[PDB]
Design a protein around this ligand. Structure first.
Ligand SMILES: CCCN1CCN(C(=O)c2cc(Cn3c(=O)[nH]c(=O)c4ccccc43)ccc2F)C[C@H]1C
Length: 349
């Protein structure tokens, strides 16, 4: 019987939940009868990315006769639940982004499931502890009365956007997390200027992969047109922006969100989509300029790292696609994951 704290045990149950993985697959219209969770593999996913990169090609350069063949070959690699079908045609930039998002999620599910079916079987040990070891991550419950908790709750309290007012958030648990060897990976960037504590939200079925592998970049095979600022790791300074990417609902209202230390450095600032393969010389990150920004006068420091937890104000930026800020790094060593919060979404709709 596990001696880990209850909060940590409920987190391990959540993230290694096999039924939740399957639920996510049918959310993306996959056929589990033909492509079940156990049949999933990296090279099928990478091949699908490549077929999706070809559909990208033909969309950019403009016919519905040829596209049909490309579209069909995508469905061959990743079976969808359409019966005797004629499935929907993949003929635009949206469809490319939608299937790229699915394949991102499938990659993290394969990793989680592979940990689950890899390794040893020992009935004397609590499965919770066994699965905790597979994450190679030290998780400790942050105390509610501590100063680091007060700052984090104030970051959540102050940075909920008016346009995301369909819900509010309760911080249920705050975990301090330390991935094995990540501090050693981060070392070159640790004293770099413009380090910031930023949100990353993701569905709970991705977190086993995230805590085992770290936040990763989408692979070479993936279509760079499927991501607004190319293939990097994306963070926000407004909690609700990242919270939306949990994909919680009335029938699934508990989510997970990270706080990471992100070495932004010299930010290449952008107002509109720009599907870059690499930064311009001397830039360490992209900053997608939002219309609203957290108040710069209210920046607080937590362990020498800036925490932009001021209330939302006007940035004074005019012709921008983004309502709120957005931060992207393109080297995975520029991220050091610091906290993990478990959130209860109170939907009012
Ligand atoms: C192997 C799949 C690795 N994934 C792919 C998507 N990754 C992203 O960083 C990413 C995430 C999003 C969506 N997204 C998001 O999922 N969570 C956020 O907190 C977020 C914040 C600002 C802007 C976008 C956000 C869009 C495009 C992206 F490239 C890295 C990683 C989580």
């Amino acid at each position: 019987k596990s001696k880990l704290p209850k909060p940590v045990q409920d987190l391990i149950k959540m993230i290694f939940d096999v039924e939740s993985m399957k639920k996510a697959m049918v959310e993306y219209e996959i056929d589990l009868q033909k492509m079940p969770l156990g049949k999933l593999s990296k090279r099928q996913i990478q091949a699908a990315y490549s077929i999706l990169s070809e559909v990208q090609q033909a969309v950019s350069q403009g016919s519905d006769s040829q596209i049909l063949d490309l579209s069909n070959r995508f469905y061959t690699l990743i079976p969808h639940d359409f019966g005797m079908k004629k499935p929907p045609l993949l003929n635009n930039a949206d469809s490319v982004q939608a299937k790229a998002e699915m394949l991102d999620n499938l990659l993290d599910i394969e990793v989680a499931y592979s940990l689950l079916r890899g390794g040893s079987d020992d009935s004397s040990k609590d499965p919770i502890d066994v699965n905790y070891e597979k994450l190679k991550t030290d998780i400790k419950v942050v105390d509610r009365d501590s100063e680091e908790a007060e700052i984090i709750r104030k970051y959540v309290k102050n940075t909920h956007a008016t346009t995301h007012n369909a819900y509010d958030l309760e911080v249920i648990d705050i975990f301090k997390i330390e991935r094995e060897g990540e501090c050693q990976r981060y070392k070159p960037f640790k004293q770099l200027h413009n380090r910031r504590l930023l949100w990353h939200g993701s569905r709970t079925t991705n977190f086993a992969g995230i805590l085992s592998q770290g936040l990763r970049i989408a692979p070479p095979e993936a279509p760079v047109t499927g991501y607004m600022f190319g293939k990097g790791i994306y963070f926000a300074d407004m909690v609700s922006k990242s919270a939306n990417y949990c994909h919680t609902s009335q029938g699934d209202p508990i989510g997970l969100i990270l706080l990471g230390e992100v070495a932004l450095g010299n930010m290449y600032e952008l107002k509109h989509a720009s599907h870059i393969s690499k930064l311009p010389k001397g830039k360490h990150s992209v900053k997608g300029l939002g219309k609203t920004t957290p108040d710069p006068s209210a920046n607080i420091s937590l362990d020498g790292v800036d925490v932009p937890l001021g209330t939302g104000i006007s940035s004074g930026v005019n012709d921008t696609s983004l309502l709120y800020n957005e931060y992207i790094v393109y080297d995975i060593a520029q991220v050091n994951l610091k906290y993990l919060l478990k959130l209860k979404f109170n939907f009012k709709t």
